[PDB]
Amino acid sequence: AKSVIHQFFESGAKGDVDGAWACFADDAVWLASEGPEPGRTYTKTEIRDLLVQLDEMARTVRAQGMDGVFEEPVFLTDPDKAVVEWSLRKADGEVVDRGIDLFTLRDGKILVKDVFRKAKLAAALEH
Amino acid sequence: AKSVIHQFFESGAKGDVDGAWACFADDAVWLASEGPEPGRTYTKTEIRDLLVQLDEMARTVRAQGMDGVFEEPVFLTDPDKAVVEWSLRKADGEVVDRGIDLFTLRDGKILVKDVFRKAKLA
């Protein structure tokens, strides 16, 4: 594949949990979009179960005619970092969920996957 | 400034709402991190009031001893795109807010500011 990031999304989209998991370095972290940290840290031993959960989530939205779209990674001037914009869309194109991943790579493996996601709300607080 | 993104953050830090607002193209959008779209689209006529609101929020959390940091902008291999990471820490050092902005530029002006943040749950 064109990069380890490309391999990750190709293996994940195909439901190959083990292949997507093997894209991570043993000291990798996946920093999920929601949790107390803020976000939540998954280490390599915890990432496989996360991929399993996400695979079952992907099968559900797929069965509802939704599309998950992962854009081509665009690298930073630090060639070991890249952003991947992504979105979940209904068949008619309505964006259901949208985010961005910031990858840090090291030695052909993912060291950090830092996940950010728009929050779908009616409103927050202003002045 | 080293770039219009630098100018935006430097003007914001200097409380110059009008100077920060003038970094945006007239067809620019600011895509806020929360709302029904998901997120919320603000146009150039709406961005100035956002900056005033953010200015007073920054003064507010600073009075409570929080430290908000914007990292140095890092440009992409597309030189008209860049990311800025940022975070907000309480007095005890606990991170309460962390996010990233993805900027798109056109001819020296900001065309898109696309804001993302972690959801803090405790």
TrEMBL record, chain B:
Q: Do you know which InterPro entries this protein is assigned to?
A: NTF2-like_dom_sf, SnoaL-like
- Signal peptide per UniProt: none
Report the residue ranges that make up the SnoaL-like domain in this protein. Answer: 6-110
- Pfam families in the record, alphabetically? SnoaL_2
UniProt name for this protein: Nuclear transport factor 2 family protein
Native organism: Saccharothrix syringae (Nocardiopsis syringae)
